[PDB]
């Protein structure tokens, strides 16, 4: 009998040495979780000591957090180095708050 | 074993020094000489 609900074959084997817990499939398209991105961004934001992280709400513009244009560029480049990605020119200049950055990093599959 | 084999050869020399053509008798084996000149232990 041929079971069409079973679609596994030798092509779909997804056992890797590095991962002790095997992954769901062989597509390496796993994105980061929301809390991980926020925690790493907060770690990056610690260097900019004019920003208070205690009751930081992410929908505020960069200016109201205490960052001017140069500090905005430095912070965006720091996050960009942190996740080992690049922001396209339109995406880099279109960022207004940390929520948009969080969403963009969430949608990215190359972020590590 | 080679010490034993060497001992048999040297004792047969002094045996034939006094008994030429006889058979040396020690233990349970007999040392005899063949007409071609070979010394063999037979038991």
């Amino acid at each position: 009998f041929q079971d069409n609900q079973d679609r596994s074959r030798v092509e779909t084997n997804s056992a890797t040495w590095a991962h002790n817990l095997p992954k769901e499939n062989k597509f390496n398209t796993e994105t980061l979780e929301k809390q991980e991105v926020e925690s790493r961004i907060l770690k990056v934001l610690s260097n900019f000591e004019q920003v208070n992280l205690k009751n930081l709400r992410w929908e505020q513009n960069f200016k109201k957090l205490g960052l001017d244009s140069l500090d905005q560029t430095a912070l965006l480049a720091s996050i960009e180095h942190e996740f080992t990605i690049l922001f396209p020119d339109g995406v880099f200049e279109g960022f207004e708050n940390l929520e948009q950055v969080v969403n963009y990093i969430l949608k990215n599959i190359n972020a590590v | 074993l080679d010490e034993g084999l060497g001992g048999l050869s040297l004792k047969y020399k002094e045996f034939v020094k006094t008994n030429p053509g006889q058979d040396l008798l020690i233990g349970n084996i007999r040392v005899t000489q063949r007409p071609n000149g070979l010394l063999v232990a037979v038991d």
């Binding site: 009998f1 084997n13 056992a15 890797t16 040495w17 590095a18 991962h19 002790n20 095997p22 | -």
Partner: protein, 231 residues
């Protein structure tokens, strides 16, 4: 290259020709005036007795276990995937043990050797006790092998593939009858050979052979039908 050469011997032809017989008594008989050690050593003829049921069963199990070990070594283990955690634990065990590879090999090859031993022993006991007295040898081989292989496929492999096990058993039985029971490509005689036993002189045999040739001439279609032109 011979298979089952001992069971296919023509004893009468071998005895007439003087050829050594594979059914001759290959036994050791200790005699008196001998030491007590050679009495014990001469008992090794037990392992040479092919009529010993326990020895035959153990030999069949050994052959099955060896085949299973070979299959695991060549095709079984490499196809299966081992979890990374288990492999890491195994390699760590090798690091902390002088001969840790042998233990890993034992753990990996024990199931296959055990299954082969059981299959060989059960197959020998099933063939020697049930199907050894059936008149139709080919049919007996086919049926026994088909049933045994269907059961083996159901047990060792998924039970949903038992039909393919039956088909494989039928094919294996046919092959076994063709080459393990019969003697093709492995013949100890010549086709058409015979042995004479009577007291007939050469003249009587020659007369009988002339009669046989006259009869044999009727096997030609042209001769029998009278379709030959004048030469």
């Amino acid at each position: 290259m011979e298979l089952n050469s001992s069971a296919k011997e023509d004893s009468h032809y071998v005895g007439v020709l003087g050829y050594p017989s594979q059914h001759d008594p290959h036994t050791l008989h200790p005699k008196k005036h001998d030491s007590t050690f050679t009495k014990v050593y001469a008992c090794r003829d037990m392992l040479w007795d092919h009529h010993w049921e326990v020895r035959n069963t153990l030999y069949a199990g050994f052959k099955g276990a060896l085949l299973g070990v070979a299959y695991a070594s060549g095709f079984g283990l490499i196809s299966k995937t081992v979890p990374s955690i288990v492999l890491k634990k195994m390699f760590r065990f090798v690091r902390n043990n002088n001969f840790g590879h042998i233990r890993i090999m034992q753990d990996l090859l024990t199931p296959y050797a055990l299954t082969g031993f059981g299959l060989g022993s059960v197959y020998y006991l099933y063939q020697h006790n049930v199907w050894e007295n059936r008149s139709n040898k080919w049919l007996a081989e086919v049926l026994s092998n088909a049933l045994f292989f269907q059961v083996a496929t159901a047990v060792c492999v998924n039970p949903g593939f038992h039909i393919y096990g039956m088909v494989g058993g039928i094919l294996f039985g046919t092959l076994k009858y063709a080459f393990y029971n019969s003697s093709f490509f492995q013949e100890k005689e010549s086709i058409g050979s015979y042995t004479t036993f009577g007291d007939l002189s050469e003249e009587e045999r020659k007369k009988q052979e002339y009669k046989d040739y006259i009869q044999f001439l009727g096997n030609y279609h042209k001769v029998r039908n009278g379709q030959l032109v004048d030469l």
